[PDB]
Amino acid sequence: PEVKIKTILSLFLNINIDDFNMDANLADAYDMDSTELADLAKEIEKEFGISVTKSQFSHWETGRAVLDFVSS
Amino acid sequence: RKRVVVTGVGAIHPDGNDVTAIKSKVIQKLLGSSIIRTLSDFDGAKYINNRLRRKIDEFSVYGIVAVEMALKASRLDVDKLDPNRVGIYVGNCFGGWQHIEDEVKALHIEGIKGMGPYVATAWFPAALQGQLSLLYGFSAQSKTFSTSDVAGMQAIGYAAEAISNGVAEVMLCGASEHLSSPLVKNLLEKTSSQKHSEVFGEKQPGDFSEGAAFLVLEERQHALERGASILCELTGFVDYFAPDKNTRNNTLEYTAELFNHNENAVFIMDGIYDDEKEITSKAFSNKEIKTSFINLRPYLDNQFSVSGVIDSVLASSFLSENEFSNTNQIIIQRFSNQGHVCALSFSAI
Amino acid sequence: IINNRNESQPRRVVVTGLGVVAPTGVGVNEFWNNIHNGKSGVSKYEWGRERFGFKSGAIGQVYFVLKSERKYLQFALDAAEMAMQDANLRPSDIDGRRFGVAIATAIADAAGMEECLLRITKGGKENIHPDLIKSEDYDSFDFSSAATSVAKKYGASMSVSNISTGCAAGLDALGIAMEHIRYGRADIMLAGASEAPLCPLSIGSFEALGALSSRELENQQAATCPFSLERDGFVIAEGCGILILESYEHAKQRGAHIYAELAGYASVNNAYHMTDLPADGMAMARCIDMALKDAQISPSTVNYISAHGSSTAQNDINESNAIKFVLGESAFGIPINSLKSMTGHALAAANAIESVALCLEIEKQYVHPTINYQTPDPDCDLDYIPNQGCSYPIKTALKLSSGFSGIHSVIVMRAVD
Ligand SMILES: *[PH](O)(O)OCC(C)(C)[C@@H](O)C(=O)NCCC(=O)NCCS[C@@H](O)CC(=O)/C=C(O)/C=C(O)/C=C(\O)CC(C)=O
């Protein structure tokens, strides 16, 4: 679910869960880099139990973008 | 050339989590199988950000908290300092095993998926140097040494040389180590005790310790202009090597020249090897020296790169004011297994 | 001083001996011949893909089960032997107290430290067994194995050190070595860097980070192609480079052959990121200025640049913008190159291998090409000497370095007369 993802990004980026908007751009809003994106992608592989290519997680610009991915 | 002074110091140890608490316990102990002592009541969330800490190792953490104390002690307004004129010197031998250990093991059982993106950044010894440059924004020449035992001693020495030649006005020099992780823990508990030096001989019985220690070295005129409280002046540095026992005695006689025939001096010794007292005294006797010997190593333990630096921060504290009183020069020495001979000289004003 | 005045004034530093171990060649003769022609030293490898599931297919190797080969220390002793023979010193010339060592490294014996961990834990399945930890394992955790061993062999009683600044460690070793000679501390100085990171712990750390090249290729030598659109990262390599630095005064007395002068050195922190490099290239541009000011040479004389050129997209833009910042419109006229197109990226060793190459380039008045140059990049639009090398009158040369912790390092090299 998104509640599961929203908690991860809240802890990873050190943001308040209530303040963190899902549709906010990760790079622009929260100063997120490609290294944090790779670390985040690892946690998605760990928890949900799926495979994520570099080409796949590269397009995760938004919090809702990773939610759309993990669903499928 | 230019003159270098110590304006601030800061350190953390199993004895205490600040310079005053460590110095108090050192005096108390001085007045009246190997293990790895850890920090008591330490919490790194008290200092470092949560987003940053999850990226870095404990050795980088210990270094960051050490400089914060040292900068605070020096009373530097960081916003007023030119970042182009400030550099960072670091000593570190073992790196950051705690952060990458489980991922190294996982890479064999799982595959690539076991490993994360921070293995390269966390483990290497120059990580502390970079994290400090991101936090404070310091842009001048910044080096990291990883020479066995002497890394932190070289870090201070060559930081002073950089200030002297006019590379920077201020320097954050020091060292940090983390020895608690399973790999380095079981290694030091077994192997490190029984090892012997070809040059210096057998090791004395003793424990190991982890933590960090840092100084704020700066140019003398820069300190006097801003009205800084100078602890002591860094008057000299020695960096030599002994390939064999013949050179060993001749090398120690160069450490003797660092005294400048000063009778009112205290000599802090390495305290790792048994034969140090005999060989150093024999070399010092040839050069007409009369000085007191102090061994902090049984109290402060073997901290590798930190062991040289932790003496310097304490030496700086005494000169700014049991046995250290009525002394205007504290010389410190540090050896290695392979045969390094290194020494620093701090003098009072 | 009326009678025979000689001063304690800044002395000049010169390169009298070279030693190299690299994929492109072992020794000076083999190493030069291959880079002159532009032959790649990148090997196609298999165990990375099969065993650990790496996307990497290329490595720069000099010559599946884990083995403690101890290549870090081997390449240092190999290269140090070549350099000292090339220098052709004799006991008379070598004063022990004036002879120092400075061999740098980024990861040291990581291959040794990783073999130890997995052996005692039985393939990383269980907890550590204290009994399985041998006495030999402790020596793998020594970062300065190369420095101390080389020092002991040749009787270097002056400053022995190991700088661990990652990818800029090679130049920083040459930098501190240069300072020792200039300021009357040393006459001779053995300087360089050794690296052996072709092990799963190291390749994975970079593969996980995204630093390494991962695009699918048939011609795997083209994985490392600096200043091209196709580039996606560095091809990891191993090796060692060693330079025998000594004073001009000492060199001329003994009748030593001189390759080139090591004129200046500078280093900075960009304070930007730990692995990311900024497009602006301000810090690198500033570092170039300081190295030239340290050398006391004008930027007008800069005739050739040996760039870091890792083949990561970020670094090749950083360096291109940095050279344009400091040199201006003159940057387009100046030839640039990257050895990593052939030799691969050997971390700290890359700086010392390229320094050995730079000394040979200056001596023979020839510049090696940047091979595998496919499609021009809009952002990287300087002259990179694509594919074919040529004769060129090198006057003043810059060697650029970059690394993790945002460290930039430069040296100014110069022909001797
Ligand atoms: P996002 O997707 O934009 O990704 C970031 C990036 C990685 C692509 C970007 O940061 C980038 O492209 N950076 C370029 C880096 C570069 O070109 N620099 C040159 C090579 S760096 C050199 O300093 C290597 C180095 O310093 C390596 C170490 O210290 C190595 C280690 O720590 C390796 C280990 O520890 C492995 C081990 C034994 O544990």
Q: What is the CATH number of the domain that holds C279?
A: 3.40.47.10
SS3 B172: strand
Please check whether residue A43 is in contact with residue A20, taking contact to mean a CB–CB distance below 8 angstroms. Answer: no
Residue C5 lies in a domain: no
> Rounded to an integer, what distance in angstroms lies between the CA atom of residue C409 and that of residue C163?
13
Please check whether residue C244 is in contact with residue C190, taking contact to mean a CB–CB distance below 8 angstroms. Answer: yes
Which structural domain, as residue segments, surrounds residue C221? 15-266
Residue in C367, C371, C370 with CA at minimum distance from that of residue C357: C367
Which structural domain, as residue segments, surrounds residue B28? 4-226
Please check whether residue B347 is in contact with residue B318, taking contact to mean a CB–CB distance below 8 angstroms. Answer: no
Residue entry with tokens 């310091």: B138
Instruction: List the alpha helices (DSSP H) in C3-70.
Output: 28-37, 47-50
- Catalytic residue annotation of C: 167, 308, 345
Q: Looking at the structure, do residues C274 and C387 belong to the same domain, yes or no? A: yes
Residue entry with tokens 């000085």: B291
Residue C276 lies in a domain: yes
Instruction: List the alpha helices (DSSP H) in C193-345.
Output: 200-209, 248-253, 282-295, 313-327
SS3 C291: helix
Q: Looking at the structure, do residues C224 and C345 belong to the same domain, yes or no? A: no
Which one of B88, B158, B183 has the shortest CB-CB distance to C117? B183
Q: B170-177 and B86-91: which strand pairing?
A: parallel
For C65, other C-beta atoms within 10 Å of its C-beta total 6
- The enclosing domain of B165 has a CATH number of 3.40.47.10
Please check whether residue C257 is in contact with residue C406, taking contact to mean a CB–CB distance below 8 angstroms. Answer: no
> Rounded to an integer, what distance in angstroms lies between the CA atom of residue C91 and that of residue C105?
29
Q: Looking at the structure, do residues C241 and C103 belong to the same domain, yes or no? A: yes
Residue C6 lies in a domain: no
Q: Which residue of B has its CA nearest to C162?
A: B147
User: Which tokens in the block code for residue B103?
Assistant: 């991922």
Contact C208 A33 (CB under 8 A): no
Q: Looking at the structure, do residues C195 and C333 belong to the same domain, yes or no? A: no
> Rounded to an integer, what distance in angstroms lies between the CA atom of residue C282 and that of residue C302?
19
- The answer to whether residue A45 neighbours chain B at the CB level (below 8 Å) is yes
Which of A11, A13, A14 is the best mutation test for B, with the most CBs of B within 10 A?
A: A14
**Cα-Cα-Cα-Cα dihedral sign, residues B327, B15, B272, B146:** negative
Q: Looking at the structure, do residues C359 and C247 belong to the same domain, yes or no? A: no
Which of C250, C266, C282 terminates a domain? The answer is: C266
Residue entry with tokens 């002994």: B242
Please check whether residue B8 is in contact with residue B72, taking contact to mean a CB–CB distance below 8 angstroms. Answer: yes
For B257, other C-beta atoms within 10 Å of its C-beta total 12
Please check whether residue C235 is in contact with residue C311, taking contact to mean a CB–CB distance below 8 angstroms. Answer: yes
> What is the DSSP track for B195-257?
--BTTTBPBPP--EE-EEEEEEEEEHHHHHHHT----EEEEEEEEEE-SSHHHHHHHHHHHHT
User: Which tokens in the block code for residue A9?
Assistant: 């990004």
Q: How far apart are the first and last CA of chain C?
A: 30
> Rounded to an integer, what distance in angstroms lies between the CA atom of residue B112 and that of residue C112?
20
Q: Tell me, what DSSP letter sits at residue B40?
A: S
> Rounded to an integer, what distance in angstroms lies between the CA atom of residue C220 and that of residue C45?
9
Residue type, C406: G
Q: Looking at the structure, do residues C82 and C21 belong to the same domain, yes or no? A: yes
Q: B329-335 and B340-347: which strand pairing?
A: antiparallel
Which of B49, B50, B51 is the best mutation test for A, with the most CBs of A within 10 A?
A: B51
What are the φ/ψ torsions at residue C188 (nearest 5 degrees)?
-115, 150
What is the distance of C-alpha B222 from the center of its chain?
A: 24
For B48, other C-beta atoms within 10 Å of its C-beta total 18
Q: B208-209 and C25-26: which strand pairing?
A: unpaired
Q: Looking at the structure, do residues C237 and C247 belong to the same domain, yes or no? A: yes
> Rounded to an integer, what distance in angstroms lies between the CA atom of residue B130 and that of residue C55?
28
> Rounded to an integer, what distance in angstroms lies between the CA atom of residue B214 and that of residue B172?
7
Map C199-217 to HEC letters. CHHHHHHHHHHCCECCCCC
Instruction: List the alpha helices (DSSP H) in B84-150.
Output: 97-109, 119-123, 127-136
Q: Looking at the structure, do residues C105 and C188 belong to the same domain, yes or no? A: yes
- The response to whether residue C167 sits with its C-beta less than 6 Å from ligand 1 reads yes
User: Which tokens in the block code for residue A72?
Assistant: 């499928």
User: Which tokens in the block code for residue C153?
Assistant: 């062999």
> Rounded to an integer, what distance in angstroms lies between the CA atom of residue A52 and that of residue A23?
21
Q: Tell me, what DSSP letter sits at residue B139?
A: -
Number of domains in chain C: 2
For C67, other C-beta atoms within 10 Å of its C-beta total 11
* H/E segment holding residue B266: strand B266-268
Residue C3 lies in a domain: no
Q: Strand B232-241's sheet: what is its strand order?
A: B144-145, B86-91, B170-177, B211-219, B4-12, B232-241, B340-347, B329-335, B266-268, B292-294
Q: Looking at the structure, do residues C66 and C46 belong to the same domain, yes or no? A: yes
Q: Which residues of A touch B113 (CB under 8 A)?
A: 42, 45
> Rounded to an integer, what distance in angstroms lies between the CA atom of residue B144 and that of residue B146?
7
Instruction: List the alpha helices (DSSP H) in C306-386.
Output: 313-327, 348-364
Task: Specify the length of chain A in residues.
Answer: 72
Residue type, C292: L
For A15, other C-beta atoms within 10 Å of its C-beta total 17
> Rounded to an integer, what distance in angstroms lies between the CA atom of residue C58 and that of residue C235?
6
